[PDB]
């Protein structure tokens, strides 16, 4: 656990809900993390859902 | 021993806030398609990431299967809704399916982050295993095994430098530089000790010092770790 578990919420929150705003977990600069790689396709999905749900 | 529940709870307000609602429609079916496309695109990255991940493979794959299942339920619901956007029942069945989908997404991210952290901490073991090779190596091997170490160590120096700058407590900043400084010196002392054992294989103290110095290498690796996960 430690600092990485206590900050896990804010890292996930930053990648999926960046507008609602932190230690990094990147091992080298040439390799983006799972969360970094999943952030944008995660945000697009939510934006797609919001548009659908709010159809009038 | 996974415990994603506590993080999932903290983000649930965000998922629920965004899934709040602030004849056949053609303009609704394209929105529905968009979501399906966004679903497929997200599914493609998650499969890729679950595959390459060296930790929590089975757990991460299960997390993507869950996301897919929720995606299909959302797909079906959104298709029924787009067929007649006037119904509140099919509107609500879609909204609930959406909230379930994003919650499965959110749980996937949480697992993916837990693997980011295990990939990060592996550098300690990789370096420790690199100094086992130095310890258990003719003079040609030692020079070589010490080349591999320094390469892995540089890749460890990146992580440990970023972590030492992220430390807020000044007392903790010193601990990090101490343990990372302790590993640096004893690694060389390991090379000297491993060298002294090749030239004198029958001197028991040469073996005794090498084993001791390697223990010193353990204590710093662990010290670097403890300063990181705190």
From Swiss-Prot, chain A:
Effect of a null allele: Sympathetic ganglia-specific conditional knockout mice lead to a reduction in sympathetic ganglia size and in progenitor cell number, but does not alter sympathetic innervation of peripheral target organs.
Post-translational modification: Phosphorylated by NEK2. EGF stimulates tyrosine phosphorylation. Phosphorylation by CDK2 regulates insulin internalization. Ubiquitinated by the SCF(BTRC) E3 ligase complex when phosphorylated by GSK3B, leading to its degradation. Ubiquitinated by a E3 ubiquitin ligase complex containing UBE2D1, SIAH1, CACYBP/SIP, SKP1, APC and TBL1X, leading to its subsequent proteasomal degradation. Ubiquitinated and degraded following interaction with SOX9. Ubiquitinated via 'Lys-11'- and 'Lys-29'-linked ubiquitin chains by UBR5, leading to its stabilization.
Paired cysteines (S-S): none
Residue numbers carrying Phosphotyrosine: 55
Cellular compartment(s): Cytoplasm; Nucleus; Cytoplasm, Cytoskeleton; Cell junction, Adherens junction
Tissue expr: Expressed in cerebellar granule neurons (at protein level). Expressed in the intestinal epithelium (at protein level). Abundantly expressed in the tooth, skin, lung, kidney, eye and brain with weak expression in the liver and heart.
Protein task: Key downstream component of the canonical Wnt signaling pathway. In the absence of Wnt, forms a complex with AXIN1, AXIN2, APC, CSNK1A1 and GSK3B that promotes phosphorylation on N-terminal Ser and Thr residues and ubiquitination of CTNNB1 via BTRC and its subsequent degradation by the proteasome. In the presence of Wnt ligand, CTNNB1 is not ubiquitinated and accumulates in the nucleus, where it acts as a coactivator for transcription factors of the TCF/LEF family, leading to activate Wnt responsive genes. Also acts as a coactivator for other transcription factors, such as NR5A2.
Assembly mode: Two separate complex-associated pools are found in the cytoplasm. The majority is present as component of an E-cadherin/ catenin adhesion complex composed of at least E-cadherin/CDH1 and beta-catenin/CTNNB1, and possibly alpha-catenin/CTNNA1; the complex is located to adherens junctions. The stable association of CTNNA1 is controversial as CTNNA1 was shown not to bind to F-actin when assembled in the complex. Alternatively, the CTNNA1-containing complex may be linked to F-actin by other proteins such as LIMA1. Binds NHERF1.
Family: Belongs to the beta-catenin family.
Protein name stated in the entry: Catenin beta-1
Record organism: Mus musculus
Chain's gene name: Ctnnb1
Residues of the full protein shown: 83 to 143 of 781
From Swiss-Prot, chain B:
Signal peptide: none
Location relative to the cell: Cell membrane; Cytoplasm; Cytoplasm, Cytoskeleton; Cell junction, Adherens junction
Tissue expression per record: Expressed almost exclusively in the nervous system.
Disruption phenotype: Mice generally die within 24 hours after birth. They display altered Purkinje cells migration, unstable synaptic junctions, defective ventricular architecture, impaired axon migration, reduced number of neurons in specific nuclei, and disordered laminar formation.
Further facts: The cdf (cerebellar deficient folia) mice are viable but are ataxic and have cerebellar hypoplasia associated with abnormal lobulation of the cerebellum. They also display defects in Purkinje cells positioning and in packing density and lamination. Fear conditioning and prepulse inhibition of the startle response are altered in cdf mice. Those phenotypes are associated with alteration of the Ctnna2 gene which results in the C-terminal truncation of the protein and are rescued by expression of a Ctnna2 transgene (isoform 2).
Role description: May function as a linker between cadherin adhesion receptors and the cytoskeleton to regulate cell-cell adhesion and differentiation in the nervous system. Required for proper regulation of cortical neuronal migration and neurite growth. It acts as a negative regulator of Arp2/3 complex activity and Arp2/3-mediated actin polymerization. It thereby suppresses excessive actin branching which would impair neurite growth and stability. Regulates morphological plasticity of synapses and cerebellar and hippocampal lamination during development. Functions in the control of startle modulation.
Subunit record text: Interacts with CDH1 and CDH2. Interacts with ZNF639; recruits CTNNA2 to the nucleus. Interacts with F-actin.
Similarity remark: Belongs to the vinculin/alpha-catenin family.
Protein name as annotated: Catenin alpha-2
The species this protein was found in: Mus musculus (Mouse)
Organism ancestry: Eukaryota, Metazoa, Chordata, Craniata, Vertebrata
């Amino acid at each position: 656990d430690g600092q990485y578990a206590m900050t896990r919420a804010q890292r996930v929150r930053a990648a999926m809900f960046p507008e609602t705003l932190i230690p990094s977990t990147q091992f080298d600069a040439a390799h983006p993390t799972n969360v970094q790689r999943l952030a944008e396709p995660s945000q697009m999905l939510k934006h797609a859902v919001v548009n659908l749900i709010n159809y009038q | 021993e996974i415990r994603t529940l506590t993080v999932e709870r903290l983000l649930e307000p965000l998922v629920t806030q965004v899934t709040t609602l602030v004849g056949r429609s053609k303009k609704a079916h394209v929105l529905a398609a968009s979501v399906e496309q966004a679903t497929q695109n997200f599914l493609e990255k998650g499969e890729q990431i679950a595959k390459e991940s060296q930790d929590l493979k089975e757990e991460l794959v299960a997390a993507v299967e869950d996301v897919r299942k929720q995606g299909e339920t959302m797909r079906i619901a959104s298709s029924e809704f787009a067929d007649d956007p006037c119904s509140s029942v099919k509107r609500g069945t879609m909204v609930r399916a959406a909230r379930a989908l994003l919650s499965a997404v959110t749980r996937l991210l949480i697992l993916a982050d837990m693997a980011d952290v295990m990939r990060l901490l592996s550098h300690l073991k990789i370096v420790e295993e690199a100094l086992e090779a130095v310890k258990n190596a003719n003079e040609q091997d030692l020079a070589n095994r010490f080349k591999e170490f320094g390469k892995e160590m540089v890749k460890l120096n990146y992580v440990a430098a970023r972590r030492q700058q992220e430390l807020k407590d000044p007392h903790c900043r010193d601990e990090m530089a101490a343990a990372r400084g302790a590993l640096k010196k004893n690694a060389t002392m390991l090379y000297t000790a491993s060298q002294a054992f090749l030239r004198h294989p029958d001197v028991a103290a040469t073996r005794a010092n090498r084993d001791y110095v390697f223990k010193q290498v353990q204590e710093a690796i662990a010290g670097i770790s403890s300063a990181a996960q705190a």
